[PDB]
Amino acid sequence: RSLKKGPFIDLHLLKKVEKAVESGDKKPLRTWSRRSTIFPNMIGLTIAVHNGRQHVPVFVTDEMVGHKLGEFAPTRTYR
Amino acid sequence: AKLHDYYKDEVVKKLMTEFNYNSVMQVPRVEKITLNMGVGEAIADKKLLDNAAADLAAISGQKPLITKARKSVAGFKIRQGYPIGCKVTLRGERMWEFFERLITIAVPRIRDFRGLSAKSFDGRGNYSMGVREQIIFPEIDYDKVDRVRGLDITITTTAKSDEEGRALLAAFDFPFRK
Amino acid sequence: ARIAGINIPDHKHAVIALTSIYGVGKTRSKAILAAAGIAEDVKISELSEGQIDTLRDEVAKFVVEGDLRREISMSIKRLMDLGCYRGLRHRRGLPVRGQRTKTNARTRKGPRKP
RNA sequence: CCUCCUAAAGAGUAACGGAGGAGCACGAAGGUUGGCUAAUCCUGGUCGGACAUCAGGAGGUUAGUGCAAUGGCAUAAGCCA
RNA sequence: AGGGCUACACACGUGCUACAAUGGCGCAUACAAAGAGAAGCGACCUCGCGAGAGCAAGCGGACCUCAUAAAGUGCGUCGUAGUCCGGAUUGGAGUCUGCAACUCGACUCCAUGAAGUCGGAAUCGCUAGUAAUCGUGGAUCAGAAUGCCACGGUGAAUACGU
Ligand SMILES: [Mg+2]
Ligand SMILES: [Mg+2]
Ligand SMILES: [Mg+2]
Ligand SMILES: [Mg+2]
Ligand SMILES: [Mg+2]
Ligand SMILES: [Mg+2]
């Protein structure tokens, strides 16, 4: 997940996750910006992360931050 | 009797002003150490038993008491005899003396010790906690030794309650944890 | 001598031998001799007291043996009990470094399961 | 041939009645002296987990008795030397 | 827009790298060919363990750059051990590319160091600068080569016979 120096996330979440902070914890954040990185303000929030067919819920936890929002949503179906 | 004396003087009074024991003949004393080390197996090697024994006869200057099977029947083999381990309790002198080399050097010769349970007690006041593994303490050539070991030790104190059991033990340099 | 992990990597060379330490390698082993003031051609076995003494002392810093082989699981464990593609891979024994599972994976996952 | 019921609280009593065993085993599994006491459960303990050994408590012949059944057994016949 | 064509319990083809001492590792160090390049090659020096970053020369090329070839030779070390072999795997952290590195990039650092001790039946290429082996360049292309095309170094064995 290298990126040298500069954590990046699509504009969508950046404006959505921040708004959730003030508005308060509520419905998830329907988005496809899985390629983005998880932030601390996202912790405790809900985000509808799309995978292939439909989106999926997410429980932004402490340690679950520096990671990409996408790695927490399997896409393929095996057995 | 290092801890022994320490008990009389230092300890005792601590409990006397704690639970307010009206009689000196009430302060939870130390009721022998137990030790067990159930090497089990045996049926397979039969030698890992004597090894465990000797390993026990090490930490303890007294000869180990090779136990025997009881029910025999089990989810495995095992019969009437079928040796399994060697308890070998402790007695005052050798006891405290051991209770010394323990916590003062045994527990110290940790593995990653960072806090001892405070619920290893039974419910009557006596405690019990298996080291989960022979800390390789003063054994025959710590490096030139047998494959691991591991054993269990039961405090067993004349405490009328687990609560008082906490005061005791901890009354000494007993590690523990919060 | 026990050095650290009790290991007795002697009768060889300070470097190559010290590498026996579960936590040190060709790099750390050949470097520790610097702060420990030890050569390379020196047989750990022949090493005078202080010689090995310095070793253990300097290696006391960098994490090795137990703590490593131990804590090394903490990280892996995390992802696992985390719910990320990383850990998810481990439980399934599949390649985490993103390899081709279609074929060639005998190392990562079991060999033959016909 | 041995045990229990049938067998009407002494003994005994039948059926092609209802049930189950013997045709042995031990130089110790005999003798004696000395000593010991189960089963099962709960609580707590390296690996010991349903159940291996250890500590505590409840419990009390529910254990065991060389092999059927009945009767007997703690002063133990039960167990160890 | 996100994802899938990179999925897996499997089987077959083509390859790469080892199973070591005709070797590994250290240090020193001799020789080549063919090529490539203005949205490109990029020196020099500053730093970074290194990938790489900063400044910025030179070249649109028998001037510059890519770009101190490898095997090898001298010495030293190892001593035949799953071993200073071999490197898969995985963990921690980084460099750069690109909106964009989860799925699914290449590479660097430290640690970890598996299988593997030359492979059944069967089967493939190669008759000389060939086989074998050792490095080097390019097209594609932002960035993902063990592949494809090309270049040179060293350098055999054997062929009665059908
Ligand atoms: Mg009668
Ligand atoms: Mg009558
Ligand atoms: Mg229990
Ligand atoms: Mg394809
Ligand atoms: Mg190019
Ligand atoms: Mg290219």
Cβ <8 Å between C85 and A71: yes
The answer to whether some atom of strand E lies closer than 7 Å to the beta carbon of A54 is no
Cβ <8 Å between A64 and C82: yes
The angstrom resolution of this structure is 3.5
* Residue B23, Cβ density class (10 Å: 0-12 exposed, 13-18 middle, ≥19 buried): exposed
The tokens for B34 are: 């137990």
Q: With helix as H, strand as E and coil as C, how does A11-73 read?
A: HHHHHHHHHHHHHCCCCCCCECHHHCECCHHHCCCCCCEECCCCEECCCCCCCCCCCEHHHHC
Q: Give strand D nucleotides closer than 7 A to any protein Cβ.
A: 39-40, 43-57
CA of C4 to nearest chain B CA: how many angstroms apart?
A: 12
B67: Cβ contacts below 8 Å, ≥ 6 apart: B38, B83, B84, B85, B86, B87
- Chains interfacing with B (3 or more CB pairs < 8 Å): C
For every residue of B74-102, DSSP letters joined together read: SSS---SS----B-----HHHHHHHHHHT
For every residue of B114-152, DSSP letters joined together read: ----S--B-SSS-BEEE-SS---TT-TTTTS--S----E
CA of C50 to nearest chain A CA: how many angstroms apart?
A: 44
- Helix, strand or coil, per DSSP, at residue B11: helix
Q: Are B130 and B111 in contact (CB under 8 A)?
A: no
Solved using: X-ray
Distance C34 CA to ligand 1 centre (A): 105
Query: What is the C-alpha to C-alpha distance for residues C64 and C28, in angstroms, rounded to an integer?
Result: 11
Residue type present at position C67? D
Distance C113 CA to ligand 6 centre (A): 40
Q: Which H or E run contains B65?
A: none
Residue written as tokens 């593995």?
B111
Counting one residue from chain B and one from chain C, the pairs whose CB atoms sit within 8 A come to 8
Residue B92, Ramachandran bin (φ over 0: left; ψ between -120 and 50: alpha; else beta): left
Cβ <8 Å between A72 and C88: no
Residue A17: which domain range? 1-79
Cα dihedral value B138, B143, B147, B150, nearest 10: 30
DSSP symbol at C73: H
Query: What is the C-alpha to C-alpha distance for residues A21 and A58, in angstroms, rounded to an integer?
Result: 16
The answer to whether some atom of strand E lies closer than 7 Å to the beta carbon of C80 is no
Query: What is the C-alpha to C-alpha distance for residues B53 and B60, in angstroms, rounded to an integer?
Result: 10
Q: For A60, name the nearest residue in chain C, comparing CA atoms only.
A: C82
Beta-bridge partner residues of A49: A31, A56
CA of C41 to C1' of E74 (A): 21
Nearest by CB to B143, which of C2, C66, C70?
A: C2
Q: Are C34 and C59 in contact (CB under 8 A)?
A: no
User: Which chain A residues are within 8 Å of C82, Cβ to Cβ?
Assistant: 61, 63-64
Residue type present at position B3? L
Q: Give strand E nucleotides closer than 7 A to any protein Cβ.
A: 1-13, 77-79, 84, 88-92, 94-107, 109-115
Residue type present at position A72? F
The tokens for A75 are: 């896409």
Q: How many residues does chain B have?
A: 178
Q: Is C83 on the interface with A (CB under 8 A)?
A: yes
Q: How far is CA A16 from CA A39, A72, B13, C72, in A?
A: 12, 18, 65, 36
Q: Measured in whole angstroms, how far is the alpha carbon of residue B114 from the centre of its chain?
A: 19
Cβ <8 Å between C88 and A74: yes
Distance C18 CA to ligand 2 centre (A): 98
Count of structural domains within chain A: 1
Q: Are C44 and C14 in contact (CB under 8 A)?
A: yes
CA of A2 to C1' of E27 (A): 37
CA of C29 to C1' of D28 (A): 69
